[PDB]
Amino acid sequence: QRECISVHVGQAGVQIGNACWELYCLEHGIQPDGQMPSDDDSFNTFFSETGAGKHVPRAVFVDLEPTVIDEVRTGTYRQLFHPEQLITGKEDAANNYARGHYTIGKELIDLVLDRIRKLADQCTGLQGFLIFHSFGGGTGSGFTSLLMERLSVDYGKKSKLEFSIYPAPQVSTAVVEPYNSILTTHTTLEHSDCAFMVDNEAIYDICRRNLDIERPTYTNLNRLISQIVSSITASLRFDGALNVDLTEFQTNLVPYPRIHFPLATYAPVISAEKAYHEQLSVAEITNACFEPANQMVKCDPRHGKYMACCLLYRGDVVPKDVNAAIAAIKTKRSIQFVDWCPTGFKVGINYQPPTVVPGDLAKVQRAVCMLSNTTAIAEAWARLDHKFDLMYAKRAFVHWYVGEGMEEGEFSEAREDMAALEKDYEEVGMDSVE
Amino acid sequence: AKNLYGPGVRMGNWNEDVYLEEERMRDFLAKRDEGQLLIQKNRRLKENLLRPMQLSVSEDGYIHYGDKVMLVNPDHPEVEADLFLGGDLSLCMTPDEIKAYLSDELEVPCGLSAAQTKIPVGRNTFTILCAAGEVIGQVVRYGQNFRLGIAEGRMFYLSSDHRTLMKSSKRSWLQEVYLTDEDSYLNCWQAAFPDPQLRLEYEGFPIPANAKILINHCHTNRGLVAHRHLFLSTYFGKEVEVAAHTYLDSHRVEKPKNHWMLVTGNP
Amino acid sequence: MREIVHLQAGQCGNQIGAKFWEVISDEHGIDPTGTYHGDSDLQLERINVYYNEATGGKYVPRAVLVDLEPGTMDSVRSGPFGQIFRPDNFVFGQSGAGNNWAKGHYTEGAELVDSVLDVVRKEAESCDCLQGFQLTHSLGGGTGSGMGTLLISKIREEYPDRIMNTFSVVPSPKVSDTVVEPYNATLSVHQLVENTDETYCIDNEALYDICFRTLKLTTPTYGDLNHLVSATMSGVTTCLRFPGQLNADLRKLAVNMVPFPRLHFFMPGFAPLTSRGSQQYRALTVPELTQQMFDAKNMMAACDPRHGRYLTVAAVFRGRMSMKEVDEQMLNVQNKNSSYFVEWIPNNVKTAVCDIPPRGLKMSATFIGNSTAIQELFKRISEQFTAMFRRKAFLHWYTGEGMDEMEFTEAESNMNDLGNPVVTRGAC
Amino acid sequence: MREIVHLQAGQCGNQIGAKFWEVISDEHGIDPTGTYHGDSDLQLERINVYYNEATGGKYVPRAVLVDLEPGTMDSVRSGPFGQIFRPDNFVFGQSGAGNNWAKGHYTEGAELVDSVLDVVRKEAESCDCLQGFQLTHSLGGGTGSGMGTLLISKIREEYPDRIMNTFSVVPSPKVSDTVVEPYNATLSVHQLVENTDETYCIDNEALYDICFRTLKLTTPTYGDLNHLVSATMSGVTTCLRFPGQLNADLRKLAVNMVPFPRLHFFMPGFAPLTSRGSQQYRALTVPELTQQMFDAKNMMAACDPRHGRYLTVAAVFRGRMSMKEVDEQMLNVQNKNSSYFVEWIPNNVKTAVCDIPPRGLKMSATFIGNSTAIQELFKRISEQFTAMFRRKAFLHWYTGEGMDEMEFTEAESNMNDLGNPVVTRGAC
Amino acid sequence: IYRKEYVPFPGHRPDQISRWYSKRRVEYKHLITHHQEPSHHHLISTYDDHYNRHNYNPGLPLLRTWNKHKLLWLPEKADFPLLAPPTNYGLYERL
Numbered sequence A: 001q002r003e004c005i006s007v008h009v010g011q012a013g014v015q016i017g018n019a020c021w022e023l024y025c026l027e028h029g030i031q032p033d034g035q036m037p038s039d040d041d042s043f044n045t046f047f048s049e050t051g052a053g054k055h056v057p058r059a060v061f062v063d064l065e066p067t068v069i070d071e072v073r074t075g076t077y078r079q080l081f082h083p084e085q086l087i088t089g090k091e092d093a094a095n096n097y098a099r100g101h102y103t104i105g106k107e108l109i110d111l112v113l114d115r116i117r118k119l120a121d122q123c124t125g126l127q128g129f130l131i132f133h134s135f136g137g138g139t140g141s142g143f144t145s146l147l148m149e150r151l152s153v154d155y156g157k158k159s160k161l162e163f164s165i166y167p168a169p170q171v172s173t174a175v176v177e178p179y180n181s182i183l184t185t186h187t188t189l190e191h192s193d194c195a196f197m198v199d200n201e202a203i204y205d206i207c208r209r210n211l212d213i214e215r216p217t218y219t220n221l222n223r224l225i226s227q228i229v230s231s232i233t234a235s236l237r238f239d240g241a242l243n244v245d246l247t248e249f250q251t252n253l254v255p256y257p258r259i260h261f262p263l264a265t266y267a268p269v270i271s272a273e274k275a276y277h278e279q280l281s282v283a284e285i286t287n288a289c290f291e292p293a294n295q296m297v298k299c300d301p302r303h304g305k306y307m308a309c310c311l312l313y314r315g316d317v318v319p320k321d322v323n324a325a326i327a328a329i330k331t332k333r334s335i336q337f338v339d340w341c342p343t344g345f346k347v348g349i350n351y352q353p354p355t356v357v358p359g360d361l362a363k364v365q366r367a368v369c370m371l372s373n374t375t376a377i378a379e380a381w382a383r384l385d386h387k388f389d390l391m392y393a394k395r396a397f398v399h400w401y402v403g404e405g406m407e408e409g410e411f412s413e414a415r416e417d418m419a420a421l422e423k424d425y426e427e428v429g430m431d432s433v434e
Numbered sequence B: 001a002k003n004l005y006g007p008g009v010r011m012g013n014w015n016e017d018v019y020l021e022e023e024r025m026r027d028f029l030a031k032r033d034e035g036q037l038l039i040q041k042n043r044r045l046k047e048n049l050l051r052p053m054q055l056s057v058s059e060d061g062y063i064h065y066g067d068k069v070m071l072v073n074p075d076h077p078e079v080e081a082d083l084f085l086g087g088d089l090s091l092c093m094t095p096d097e098i099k100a101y102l103s104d105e106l107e108v109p110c111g112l113s114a115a116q117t118k119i120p121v122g123r124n125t126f127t128i129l130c131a132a133g134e135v136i137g138q139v140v141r142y143g144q145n146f147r148l149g150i151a152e153g154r155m156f157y158l159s160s161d162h163r164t165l166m167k168s169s170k171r172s173w174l175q176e177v178y179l180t181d182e183d184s185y186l187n188c189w190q191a192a193f194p195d196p197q198l199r200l201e202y203e204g205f206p207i208p209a210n211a212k213i214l215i216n217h218c219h220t221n222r223g224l225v226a227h228r229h230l231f232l233s234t235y236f237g238k239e240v241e242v243a244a245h246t247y248l249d250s251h252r253v254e255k256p257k258n259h260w261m262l263v264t265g266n267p
Numbered sequence C, D: 001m002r003e004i005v006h007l008q009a010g011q012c013g014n015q016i017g018a019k020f021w022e023v024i025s026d027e028h029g030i031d032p033t034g035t036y037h038g039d040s041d042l043q044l045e046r047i048n049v050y051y052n053e054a055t056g057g058k059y060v061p062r063a064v065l066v067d068l069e070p071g072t073m074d075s076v077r078s079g080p081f082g083q084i085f086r087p088d089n090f091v092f093g094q095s096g097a098g099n100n101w102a103k104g105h106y107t108e109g110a111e112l113v114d115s116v117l118d119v120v121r122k123e124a125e126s127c128d129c130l131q132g133f134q135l136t137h138s139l140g141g142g143t144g145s146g147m148g149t150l151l152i153s154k155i156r157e158e159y160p161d162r163i164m165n166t167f168s169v170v171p172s173p174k175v176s177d178t179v180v181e182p183y184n185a186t187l188s189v190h191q192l193v194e195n196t197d198e199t200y201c202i203d204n205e206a207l208y209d210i211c212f213r214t215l216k217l218t219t220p221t222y223g224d225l226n227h228l229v230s231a232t233m234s235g236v237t238t239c240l241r242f243p244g245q246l247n248a249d250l251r252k253l254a255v256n257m258v259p260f261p262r263l264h265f266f267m268p269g270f271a272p273l274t275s276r277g278s279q280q281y282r283a284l285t286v287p288e289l290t291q292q293m294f295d296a297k298n299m300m301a302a303c304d305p306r307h308g309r310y311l312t313v314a315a316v317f318r319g320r321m322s323m324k325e326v327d328e329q330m331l332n333v334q335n336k337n338s339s340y341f342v343e344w345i346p347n348n349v350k351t352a353v354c355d356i357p358p359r360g361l362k363m364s365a366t367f368i369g370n371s372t373a374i375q376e377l378f379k380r381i382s383e384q385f386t387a388m389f390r391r392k393a394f395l396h397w398y399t400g401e402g403m404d405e406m407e408f409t410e411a412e413s414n415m416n417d418l419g420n421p422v423v424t425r426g427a428c
Numbered sequence E: 001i002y003r004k005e006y007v008p009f010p011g012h013r014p015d016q017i018s019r020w021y022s023k024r025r026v027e028y029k030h031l032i033t034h035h036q037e038p039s040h041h042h043l044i045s046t047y048d049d050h051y052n053r054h055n056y057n058p059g060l061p062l063l064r065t066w067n068k069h070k071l072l073w074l075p076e077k078a079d080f081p082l083l084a085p086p087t088n089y090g091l092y093e094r095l
């Protein structure tokens, strides 16, 4: 009855979805064939029932190009996903918002909305949409831009959560990432309700400090992202003391309708050989989140001021050690809030501990996902804006964009709106003087 | 913060910890010694409902009066719904496992099911009683007013009546079959032949021991059906419900889930 | 023979309503199956205060189970006393409150209040003299903060002369499980102050302080905490369910407890409380009850009685005892802590005795006190509201739901209006 | 005694006949074969009303089952309680109406009308004194409509003093099973008015409203819907079938519920309807049955009273009840809600109290109320019929089938007319 | 790469123990306020005690000695009548 549709845009999005739906399958009964093992209703949030018990997902996995989604219907989950739910294209956007939004969008947007409508028909109370996409490739940027421009018009009263693959500030993986990010932030700033942010360089650090794995595979990053999303989309699955629906995320983390960018942080990132030697208490499970090194995004909050934080605990947690940890953090000085949101904590509690995929993370009885809207992200934005200025100063790679119908002046609009977003960041920033 | 120790160690709140542990331990041992705990009640109810019995010997291949004969529903090739449930099921007693809970056994409504067992297990062994005037030795006849009873030493009888908006089958919405203790015309069933063409001439003949017959309640003309599509989630595994509605097919013939075989002792 | 309708909204108000019903069922001898299985007849003499009689000896509580999120319904049916309520009195809702006062005030809460009004009507005509209503909810948060105040306003407009007791869970200063508590609770307090007749501000931090520094526990969960509210909210209305000498009803408490119509903000206390260690070693006497009652530790709101003069104080006692010790012990505390009482009201203590103690206890007593120390709650949430409203913060979720800007200013103005006449009593 | 010759025409007609005859059988004990395998001797006492004794304790329902397609009849025969109806009583023809009230009132029905009238006469004549015929049909659809109306017409002339009641199932507002229903319905009321004495107006949409809202059923099957209409059908004949105090037959419920001769469209509604899982949490006290049969849901028609006013209301209580309460309730409602009842008639209510209760229930009650709200129906139908004839829609059939357009005009006339009767009396 | 890193997991049945036990902890219903000893029969009205049940029968009817170590005539004051069944009179039988 309390369901949400998971949209998975891009190569990034389809593999984020692969990891998290593997985690949901192991979380519930859900064998990979599609049936729970022989022999409560917590599945009826992500899994639609069927005669002869074939629990099928409510997600859509969209990609403008084959191979990555072609292998999904060939691998070890070939029977679980519905064959028309996984949408494939025939020609990649080739790292181009122009191709993703203006040229290769229209032969597939009708099929994507048809699938979205048929999923939405089979929902008593639809809570909203969880989209997972990159700020990198054109498939992950332009198609989800057109997707917002369609679905926000069609479903304007519905809740919207993004889980954005923000480009790394130091290492990165593309040369037109500033272009794609500067365009997608402009076109999705007014349509997003709340957009949790995740980076790759930060979790590159995370797997070498806290996993104690110098050579992990790149699957582990969306394994941890799967843990994040299974922590945040869990109160509508199981029962707890503080039951937090998706609306309270926006209500307690998005104060103003332009600033909607929190950073996530996980806890017990332990790798099963340093797990049965520590307390894993509530005080330290909060202190690990609020330490400025375990962030999903490489931007420390010491050079910033927190706006509002939402802690979601899961497992063998009593609310009053959470209360004591919140009191200790509010007494800590290096962690400091803005003066206009004093009561800046939103607590959600679930009783189910995280089910652990066979792999790197450990079996822990306590976990917390910490979603902090903060003003520190202005630095991370302004870094790509500086790169965008240095890149646009002499019109590099602009011909590929303008040959695909992308108007030239919308680049200047995107830069202007991101400058206005920096502005909105700073006067949200400074303290009371009146 | 602190270290937050557990039982045994003498720090923090250990004094009230061992006080609360002694109080809860005292309560648990008191309930265990007095034998009023949930698992003790479960074990008593289970042994009483799972005590093994014996089936009557069929000296000839005919079911007589007063003999211990079990009701089974045979295995089916029917595929009208994809959600199926096993084969060779058995009419068994199912008292509801929260509204019973306390005391010893429920009242006028009890509830029937069809489990996947084929051994005579005690909750499935039925005595073919006399209803009308007969003796302990006469053979049950096609279209004769017989009766089904099962046992605390109190004979409960299979019963049903017409459909009202107070009671029905649980998961479906058709007629309810339930175990009463009273004695009336509603307790009475009858047997008939599966084939509607060669039925009325067989009226007035003995019944074979292990054979396909139809059980018609002689107040509503409805047949006993195992509603194989759905399930009743009870303790003794997971099985199906049973109701009363005559299902016909493309020849005025009854579907295989109208059919009910009887089981005697044939070693 | 007089009735109190127990209505409860929100995921907090629901579970306090739930926990209230086991202690009422144990006091009245009702098992989870609904039949009476007890030992006395005084429990059936006045069973028609909370339980409608049905066929077959089934007593059904006159409770209204309300919430916008359909998640706590399965929990309150999952409790041990789940097969006791009507499955019509569970009124559902297939949405989320979203931690928003406007969401329960001007949207789907306002389309659910029609069904809730139909339910409270259909139970209300099944009475001879309905004494009043008893709403238990949380001021900070959703559902019960907004739509609970819808129910308060609607039933106050429809029955204008029935006693309204609301047990309201105010937010705590030390910890807040919600960012938008300074919005929700202030907008709920405005609706409370021209409506209900007897509030009870119940604070989670105060209850937690009772759990450690009085009850002396180690893992106080919501149920263990939650039951103390259930116990005081059972002990207030005891002379209506059990006989006694010098009885007292809710209007008996009200006419003695509220000097002015707007000064209806109490803070409660139920203190025959002791640890499991000291449990066998309590020497229960009326002075020992009174001294541990009037201590500023068992008080169920985050307010210090030492910082403000009490207006009026009530001790609804229960148990077989001599009430001479009741009279001169509260006289002794009145004459001793004279500076903490206002000088313009002589004999500002209401005495009432119920014969029948709570089950498992020898005697108990419930403290209900109208104090001027409620400012450490109300003024506090006023600085919180002003310091957050100045930057126009968290607002579009409130103004986009069909709600104008200036009733925030009305809310702050009429909360500072509450601030004035009870500041006045600090210096008379 | 006073026997009642039952008439059913059409699929709906024969299916509401299946349940009625099944319900009356369960009551009088008669099994699916006839033998009175029953108990209380009161059952066989007044069996004449609905049964005729064959050979050797065998009771054969007095019913003339009619249909214009040899099909619905077969389901009835080859159904469970289907060998209780005499073989000959079943009448049918190898042709069809084709949802064409025309191919029923003039073409196909004609050749078959003789046949039915023969069976009708035999049963009607072979009796001590026929209280009155009773037809169950669906104004929406053919046969039942055309052939049906033709019966009430030819039947009313031969017998011009026998209560010709009718449980017509008028079309529904929202739901619209058929498409021509507009014409069919509008074309039959002109006949019903100048033919029936008491024309009960049940609607499939309202039966649903109840099932869903009241009974709380989840998969409402047409079986359960035929049950609510049979429940009522028996209530209106309970007194003449089961000895009781304050007895009241059919002409009594017509002499105290039909103000003027053309105003005879009553909206029915049973009372003790409660969910299977709430049946344990309730009290069958007269109050309960009243509070139900008068709410704007227990009604079996889609014309809520509130909108209009009640020219009369008839209630037949099936149970051993305390006259005082039955009477008291009547006065109370009439007094409390005093704007939903007309003012030109004092005591606008007929009360009756048959003893023998419906199996399973301690008490019960059927409701037959002539309400000016019934105007809402004929209007909606007229609205649609006129929003069609304007463009000779789906007319070719109705016309060339041996008819004319003028009749359509006058049907809307007598329709729009009656609309007036139930409008002027709606206001002094 | 896909089959090598995303093998199916037969026999990896998830557990349900911890959420259930945390629920057990988060809701000891009378054992939190319960005083010195459990006694469900602890109810006598004041009229029933000091009226038509006479008085406490095991108690000292005339042996009112002077306890010195609590300087008052204790054996009547420290009585606290708790004897006998409750004030059942016939209402239970009537109902």
Ligand SMILES: Nc1nc2c(ncn2[C@@H]2O[C@H](COP(=O)(O)OP(=O)(O)OP(=O)(O)O)[C@@H](O)[C@H]2O)c(=O)[nH]1
Residues within 6 Å of the ligand: A009, A010, A011, A012, A013, A015, A016, A019, A065, A092, A093, A094, A095, A133, A134, A135, A136, A137, A138, A139, A140, A141, A165, A173, A200, A218, A219, A220, A221, A222, A223
């Ligand atoms: N867990 C995990 N994440 C991956 C893996 N491969 C890629 N990603 C994510 O995918 C992102 C790059 O994909 P996109 O920018 O969305 O590519 P695209 O939008 O489909 O456009 P094209 O490159 O033309 O196909 C990287 O930044 C990663 O975060 C993987 O193997 N495992």
Ligand SMILES: Nc1nc2c(ncn2[C@@H]2O[C@H](COP(=O)(O)OP(=O)(O)O)[C@@H](O)[C@H]2O)c(=O)[nH]1
Residues within 6 Å of the ligand: C009, C010, C011, C012, C013, C014, C015, C016, C019, C067, C097, C099, C138, C140, C141, C142, C143, C144, C145, C169, C177, C204, C222, C223, C225, C226, C227, C229
């Ligand atoms: N006494 C008591 N307090 C509770 C209970 N449940 C919750 N609380 C408090 O209620 C607060 C939050 O309630 P809230 O989220 O506003 O519920 P909502 O009204 O449904 O939104 C928490 O801070 C709890 O400390 C209870 O069952 N009993």
Ligand SMILES: Nc1nc2c(ncn2[C@@H]2O[C@H](COP(=O)(O)OP(=O)(O)O)[C@@H](O)[C@H]2O)c(=O)[nH]1
Residues within 6 Å of the ligand: D009, D010, D011, D012, D013, D015, D016, D097, D099, D138, D140, D141, D142, D143, D144, D145, D169, D177, D178, D204, D207, D222, D223, D225, D226, D229
């Ligand atoms: N109460 C009830 N109504 C029915 C049943 N079956 C059909 N109806 C109604 O009958 C209407 C159509 O009947 P109709 O086609 O006119 O039958 P016909 O008279 O033989 O043509 C539909 O709108 C149904 O709602 C039933 O079993 N019970």
